[PDB]
Amino acid sequence: EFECESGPCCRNCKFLKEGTICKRARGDDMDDYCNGKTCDCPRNPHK
C-alpha cells in the first residue's frame, strides 16, 4: 500500500514540510529542521 515510517518529522505516513523545526539548538547554534524527505530529526551538520 504505502511506504510508511514514523518519527518526529512524519505524521500519518506523510513528511512534515521541509524547514519545520524539530529540535531547538543550545546557545547560538542552528536549530535542527525536518528536510521533508525522512522521518528522523537530522542533527544539523553545521555546528
Author numbering: -1 to 45
Reproduce passages from the article.
Ech is the most extensively characterized disintegrin and has a conserved RGD motif and a long C-terminal NPHKGPAT tail. Similar to the reported structures of other disintegrins, Ech has a well-defined core composed of a series of nonclassical turns crosslinked by disulfide bonds (C2-C11, C7-C32, C8-C37, and C20-C39).
The diffraction data of Ech were obtained to a resolution of 1.80 Å from a single frozen crystal, which contained two molecules per asymmetric unit. Superimposition of the backbones of chains A and B with an RMSD value of 0.226 Å demonstrated that their overall structures were very similar, except for the RGD loop and C-terminal loop. Structural analysis showed that the RGD loop of chain B was squeezed by residues K21, R41, and K45 in contact with sulfate ions and residue S4 of chain A through crystal packing. In contrast to chain B, the R and D side chains in the RGD loop of chain A are far from each other. Furthermore, the backbones of the C-terminal GPAT residues of chain A showed a weaker electron density map. In contrast, the conformation of the C-terminal tail of Ech chain B was well defined, possibly because the C-terminal residue K45 can interact with the O atoms of SO42-. The structural analysis of Ech chains A and B showed that the side chain of the D30 residue in the RGD loop and the amide proton of the N42 residue in the C-terminus formed hydrogen bonds. Interestingly, the carboxyl group of residue M28 interacts with the side-chain Nζ proton of residue K45, and the side chain of residue D30 interacts with the side chain Nζ proton of residue K45, resulting in a unique turn structure for Ech.
